[PDB]
CSV table of C-alpha atoms and ligand atoms in Angstrom, one decimal:
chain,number,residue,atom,x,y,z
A,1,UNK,CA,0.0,0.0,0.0
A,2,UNK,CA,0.5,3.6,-0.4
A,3,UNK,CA,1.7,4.3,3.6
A,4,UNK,CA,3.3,1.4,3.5
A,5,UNK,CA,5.4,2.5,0.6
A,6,UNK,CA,6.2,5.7,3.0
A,7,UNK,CA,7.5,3.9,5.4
A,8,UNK,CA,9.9,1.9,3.5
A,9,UNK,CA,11.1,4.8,1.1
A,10,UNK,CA,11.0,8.0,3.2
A,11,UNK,CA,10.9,7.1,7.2
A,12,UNK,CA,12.9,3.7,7.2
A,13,UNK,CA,15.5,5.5,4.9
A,14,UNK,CA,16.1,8.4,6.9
A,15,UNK,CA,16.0,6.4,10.0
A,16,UNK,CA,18.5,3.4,8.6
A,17,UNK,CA,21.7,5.7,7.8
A,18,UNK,CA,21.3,8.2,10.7
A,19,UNK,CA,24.8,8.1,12.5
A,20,UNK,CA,23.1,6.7,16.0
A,21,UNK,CA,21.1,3.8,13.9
A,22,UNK,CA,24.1,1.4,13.5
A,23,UNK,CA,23.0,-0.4,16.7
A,24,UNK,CA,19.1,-1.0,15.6
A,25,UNK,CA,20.3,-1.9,12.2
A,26,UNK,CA,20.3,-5.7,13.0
A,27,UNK,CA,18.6,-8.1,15.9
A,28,UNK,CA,20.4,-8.4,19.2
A,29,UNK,CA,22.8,-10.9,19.2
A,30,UNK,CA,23.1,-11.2,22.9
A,31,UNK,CA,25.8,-13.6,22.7
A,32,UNK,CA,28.1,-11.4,20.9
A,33,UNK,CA,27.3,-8.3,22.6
A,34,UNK,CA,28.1,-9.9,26.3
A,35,UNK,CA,23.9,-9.7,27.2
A,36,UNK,CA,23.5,-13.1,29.1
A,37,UNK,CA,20.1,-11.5,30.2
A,38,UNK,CA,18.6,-9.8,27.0
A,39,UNK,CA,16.7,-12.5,26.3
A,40,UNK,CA,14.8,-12.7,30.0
A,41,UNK,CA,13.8,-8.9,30.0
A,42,UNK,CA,13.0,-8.2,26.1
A,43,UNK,CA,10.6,-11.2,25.2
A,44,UNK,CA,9.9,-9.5,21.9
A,45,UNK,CA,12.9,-8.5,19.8
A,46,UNK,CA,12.6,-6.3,16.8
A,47,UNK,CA,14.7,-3.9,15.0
A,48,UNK,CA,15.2,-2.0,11.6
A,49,UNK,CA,16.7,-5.2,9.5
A,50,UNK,CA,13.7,-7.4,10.5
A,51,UNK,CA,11.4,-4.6,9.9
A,52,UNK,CA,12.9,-3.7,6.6
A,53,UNK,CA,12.8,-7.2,5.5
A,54,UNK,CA,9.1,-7.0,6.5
A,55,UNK,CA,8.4,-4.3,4.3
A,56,UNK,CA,10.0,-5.9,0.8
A,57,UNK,CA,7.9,-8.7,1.4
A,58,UNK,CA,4.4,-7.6,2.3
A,59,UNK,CA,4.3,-8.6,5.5
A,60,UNK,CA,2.3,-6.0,6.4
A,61,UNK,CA,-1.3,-5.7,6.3
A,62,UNK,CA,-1.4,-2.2,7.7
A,63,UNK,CA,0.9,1.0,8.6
A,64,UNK,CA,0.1,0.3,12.5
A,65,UNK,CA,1.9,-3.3,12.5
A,66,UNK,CA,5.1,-1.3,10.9
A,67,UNK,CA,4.9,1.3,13.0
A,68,UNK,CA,4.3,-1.1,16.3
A,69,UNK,CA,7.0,-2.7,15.1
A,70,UNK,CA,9.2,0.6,15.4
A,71,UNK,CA,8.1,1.6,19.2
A,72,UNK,CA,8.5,-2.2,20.3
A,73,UNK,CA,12.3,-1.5,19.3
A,74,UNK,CA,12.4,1.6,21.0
A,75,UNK,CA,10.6,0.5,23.7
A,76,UNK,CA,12.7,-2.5,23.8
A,77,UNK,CA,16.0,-0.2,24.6
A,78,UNK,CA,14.8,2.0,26.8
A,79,UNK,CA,13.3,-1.0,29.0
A,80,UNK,CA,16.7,-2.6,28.8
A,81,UNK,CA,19.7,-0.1,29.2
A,82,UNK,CA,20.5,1.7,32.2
A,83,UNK,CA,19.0,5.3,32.0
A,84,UNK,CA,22.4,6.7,31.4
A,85,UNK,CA,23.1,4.8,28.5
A,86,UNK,CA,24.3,6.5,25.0
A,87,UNK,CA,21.8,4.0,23.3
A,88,UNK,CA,18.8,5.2,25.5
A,89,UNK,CA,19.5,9.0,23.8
A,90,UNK,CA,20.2,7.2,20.3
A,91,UNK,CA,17.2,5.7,19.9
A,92,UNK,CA,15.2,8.8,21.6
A,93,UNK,CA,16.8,11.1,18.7
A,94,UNK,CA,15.9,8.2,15.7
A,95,UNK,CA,12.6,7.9,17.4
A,96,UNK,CA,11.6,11.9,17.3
A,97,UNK,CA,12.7,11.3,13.5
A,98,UNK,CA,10.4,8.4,13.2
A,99,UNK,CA,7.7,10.4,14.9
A,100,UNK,CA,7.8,13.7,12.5
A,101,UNK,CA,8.3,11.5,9.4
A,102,UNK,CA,5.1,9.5,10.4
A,103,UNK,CA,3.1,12.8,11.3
A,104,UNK,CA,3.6,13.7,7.6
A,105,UNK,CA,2.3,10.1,6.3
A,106,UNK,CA,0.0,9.7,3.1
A,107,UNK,CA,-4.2,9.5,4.1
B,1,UNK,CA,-7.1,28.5,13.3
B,2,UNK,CA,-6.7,24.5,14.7
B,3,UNK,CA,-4.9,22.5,12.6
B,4,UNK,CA,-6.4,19.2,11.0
B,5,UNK,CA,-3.3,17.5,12.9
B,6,UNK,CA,-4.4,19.1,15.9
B,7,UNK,CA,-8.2,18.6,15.9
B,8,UNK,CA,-7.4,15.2,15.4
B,9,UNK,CA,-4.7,14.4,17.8
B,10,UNK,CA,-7.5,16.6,20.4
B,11,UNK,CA,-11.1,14.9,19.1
B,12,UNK,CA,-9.0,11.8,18.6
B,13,UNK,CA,-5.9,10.8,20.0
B,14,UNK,CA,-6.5,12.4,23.8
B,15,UNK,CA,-10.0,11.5,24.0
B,16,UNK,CA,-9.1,7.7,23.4
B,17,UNK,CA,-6.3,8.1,25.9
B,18,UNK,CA,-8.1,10.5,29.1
B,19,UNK,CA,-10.8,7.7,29.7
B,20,UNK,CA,-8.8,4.9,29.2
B,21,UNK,CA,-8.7,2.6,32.5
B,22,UNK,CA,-5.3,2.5,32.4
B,23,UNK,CA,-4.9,6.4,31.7
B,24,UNK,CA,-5.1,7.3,36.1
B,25,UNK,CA,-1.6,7.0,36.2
B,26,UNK,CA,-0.6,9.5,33.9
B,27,UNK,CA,-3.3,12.4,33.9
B,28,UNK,CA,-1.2,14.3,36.5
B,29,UNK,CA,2.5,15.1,36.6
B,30,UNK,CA,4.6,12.2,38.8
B,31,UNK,CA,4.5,13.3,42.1
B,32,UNK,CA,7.9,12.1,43.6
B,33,UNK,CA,6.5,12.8,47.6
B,34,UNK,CA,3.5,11.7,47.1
B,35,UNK,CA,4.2,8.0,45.3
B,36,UNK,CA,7.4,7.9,47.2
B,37,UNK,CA,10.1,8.0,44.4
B,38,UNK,CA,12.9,10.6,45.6
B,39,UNK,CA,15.2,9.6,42.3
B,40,UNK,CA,12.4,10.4,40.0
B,41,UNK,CA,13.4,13.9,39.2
B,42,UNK,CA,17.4,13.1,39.5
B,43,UNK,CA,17.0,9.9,36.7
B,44,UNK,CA,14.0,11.9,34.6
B,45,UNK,CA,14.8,15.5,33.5
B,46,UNK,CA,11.7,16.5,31.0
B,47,UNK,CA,8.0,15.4,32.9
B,48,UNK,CA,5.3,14.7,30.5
B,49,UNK,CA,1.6,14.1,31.6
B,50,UNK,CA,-1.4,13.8,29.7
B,51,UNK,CA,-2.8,16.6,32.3
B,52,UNK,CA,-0.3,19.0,30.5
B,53,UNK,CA,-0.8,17.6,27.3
B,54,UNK,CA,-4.7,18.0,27.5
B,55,UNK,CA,-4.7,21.9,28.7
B,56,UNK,CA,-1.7,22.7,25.7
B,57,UNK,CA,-4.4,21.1,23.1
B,58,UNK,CA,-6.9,23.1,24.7
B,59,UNK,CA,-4.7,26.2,25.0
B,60,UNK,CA,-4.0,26.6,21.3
B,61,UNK,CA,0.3,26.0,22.5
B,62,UNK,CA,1.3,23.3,19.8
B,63,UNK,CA,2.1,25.1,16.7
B,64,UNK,CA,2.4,21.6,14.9
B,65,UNK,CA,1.2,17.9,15.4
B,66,UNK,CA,4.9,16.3,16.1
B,67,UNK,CA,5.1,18.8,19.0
B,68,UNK,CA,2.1,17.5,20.7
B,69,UNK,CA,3.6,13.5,19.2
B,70,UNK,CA,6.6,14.5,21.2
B,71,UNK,CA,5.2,15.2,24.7
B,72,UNK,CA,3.3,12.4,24.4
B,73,UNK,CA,5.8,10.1,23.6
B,74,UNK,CA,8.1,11.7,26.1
B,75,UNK,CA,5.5,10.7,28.5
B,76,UNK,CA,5.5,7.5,28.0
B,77,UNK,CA,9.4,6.8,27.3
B,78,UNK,CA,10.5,8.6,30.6
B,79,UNK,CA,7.8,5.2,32.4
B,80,UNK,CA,10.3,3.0,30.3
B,81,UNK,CA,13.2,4.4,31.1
B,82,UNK,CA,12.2,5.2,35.0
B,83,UNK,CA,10.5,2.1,35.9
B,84,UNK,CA,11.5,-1.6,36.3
B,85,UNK,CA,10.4,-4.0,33.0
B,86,UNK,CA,8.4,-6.4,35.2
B,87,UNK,CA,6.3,-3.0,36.6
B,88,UNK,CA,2.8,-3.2,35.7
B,89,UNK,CA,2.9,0.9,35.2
B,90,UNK,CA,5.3,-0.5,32.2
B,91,UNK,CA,2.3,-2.6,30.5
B,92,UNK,CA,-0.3,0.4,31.4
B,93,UNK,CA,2.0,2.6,29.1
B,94,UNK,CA,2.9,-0.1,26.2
B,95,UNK,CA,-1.5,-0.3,26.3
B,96,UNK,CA,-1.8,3.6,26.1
B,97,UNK,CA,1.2,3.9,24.3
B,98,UNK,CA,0.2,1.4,21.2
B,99,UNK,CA,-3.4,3.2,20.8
B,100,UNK,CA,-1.9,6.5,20.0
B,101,UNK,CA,0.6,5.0,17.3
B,102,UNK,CA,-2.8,3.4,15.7
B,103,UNK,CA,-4.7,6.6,15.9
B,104,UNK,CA,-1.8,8.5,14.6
B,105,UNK,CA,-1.5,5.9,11.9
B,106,UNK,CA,-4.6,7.4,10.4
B,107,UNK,CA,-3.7,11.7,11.4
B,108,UNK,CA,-4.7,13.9,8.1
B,109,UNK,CA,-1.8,15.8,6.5
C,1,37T,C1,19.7,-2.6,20.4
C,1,37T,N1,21.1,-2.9,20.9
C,1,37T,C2,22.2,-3.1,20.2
C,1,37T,N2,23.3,-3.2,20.9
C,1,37T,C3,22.9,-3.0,22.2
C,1,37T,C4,21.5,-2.8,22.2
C,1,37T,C5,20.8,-2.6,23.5
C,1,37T,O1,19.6,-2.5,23.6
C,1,37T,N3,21.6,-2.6,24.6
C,1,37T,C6,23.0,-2.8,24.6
C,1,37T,O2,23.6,-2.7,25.6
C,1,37T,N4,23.6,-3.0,23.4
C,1,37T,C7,25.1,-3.3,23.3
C,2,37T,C1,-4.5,5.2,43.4
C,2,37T,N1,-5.3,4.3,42.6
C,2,37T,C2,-5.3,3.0,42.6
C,2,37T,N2,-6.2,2.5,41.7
C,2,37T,C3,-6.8,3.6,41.1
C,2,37T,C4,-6.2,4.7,41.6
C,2,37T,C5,-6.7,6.0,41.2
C,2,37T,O1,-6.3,7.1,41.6
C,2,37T,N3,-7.7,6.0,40.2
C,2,37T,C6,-8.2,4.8,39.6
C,2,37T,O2,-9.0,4.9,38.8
C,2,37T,N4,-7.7,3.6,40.1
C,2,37T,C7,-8.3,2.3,39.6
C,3,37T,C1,3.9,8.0,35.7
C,3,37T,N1,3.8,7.4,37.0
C,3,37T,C2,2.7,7.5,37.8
C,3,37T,N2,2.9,6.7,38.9
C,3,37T,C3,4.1,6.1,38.7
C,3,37T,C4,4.7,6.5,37.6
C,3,37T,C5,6.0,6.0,37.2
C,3,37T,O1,6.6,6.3,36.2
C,3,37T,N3,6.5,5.1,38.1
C,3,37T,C6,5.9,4.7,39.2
C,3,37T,O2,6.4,3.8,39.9
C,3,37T,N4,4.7,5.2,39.6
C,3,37T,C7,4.0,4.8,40.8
């Protein structure tokens, strides 16, 4: 669909080659990244790779499932990290992006 | 005068939110005496309530929609960053917080 076209070409570029996005590019491997506990506190993983994926192969039914997708991310680091954590104020600064890119979505 | 983005995050958004059962928690600013949280203010800098929220929508303050998509989702990321994961205020957020991206989903403009 139209939004869904949007999403992919306008807010998932701008949001994939932002200088803070390198961490949300791909899932948590919590093996590499020395996170023994990731797994016990986020029960749903997502990030920008899975999402993308979703979006070239019409995964979607809607513009809400993409954009749940996106907060359960963000919601997903903030939950995590420490509140002092440079990731918590990356993925607050690629999701105010996300947020003015999606106010100016196709109806 | 009101923006379509505005009307709609006002006739829409915060009237979806404001009667929700799960909204009690957030219709007034945290009060860190009064719940008994004396880090509150020391780990969260910018407070966000949908009190504040409601009387700037009434108020004519927001001159665009992503100003009044901010305070909202500063509201809610300050519970996820504040809180524990296994708090239930957590869950009361991701409920509220998952209605507003549907309604903004379908904002005009
Ligand atoms: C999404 N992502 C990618 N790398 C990380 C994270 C995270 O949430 N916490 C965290 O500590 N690290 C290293
Ligand atoms: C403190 N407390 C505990 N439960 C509640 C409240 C309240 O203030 N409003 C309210 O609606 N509910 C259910
Ligand atoms: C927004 N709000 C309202 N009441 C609370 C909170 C919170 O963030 N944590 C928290 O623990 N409590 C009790």
């Amino acid at each position: 669909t139209n939004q869904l076209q949007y999403l992919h070409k306008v807010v998932m570029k701008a949001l994939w080659k932002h200088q803070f996005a390198w961490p949300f590019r791909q899932p948590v491997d919590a093996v590499k990244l020395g996170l023994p506990d990731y797994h016990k506190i986020i029960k749903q993983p997502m990030d920008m790779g899975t999402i993308k994926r979703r979006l070239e192969n019409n995964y979607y039914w809607a513009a809400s499932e993409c954009m749940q997708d996106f907060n359960t991310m963000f919601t997903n680091c903030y939950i995590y990290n420490k509140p002092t954590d440079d990731i918590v104020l990356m993925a607050q600064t690629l999701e105010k992006i996300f947020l003015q890119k999606v106010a100016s979505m196709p109806q």
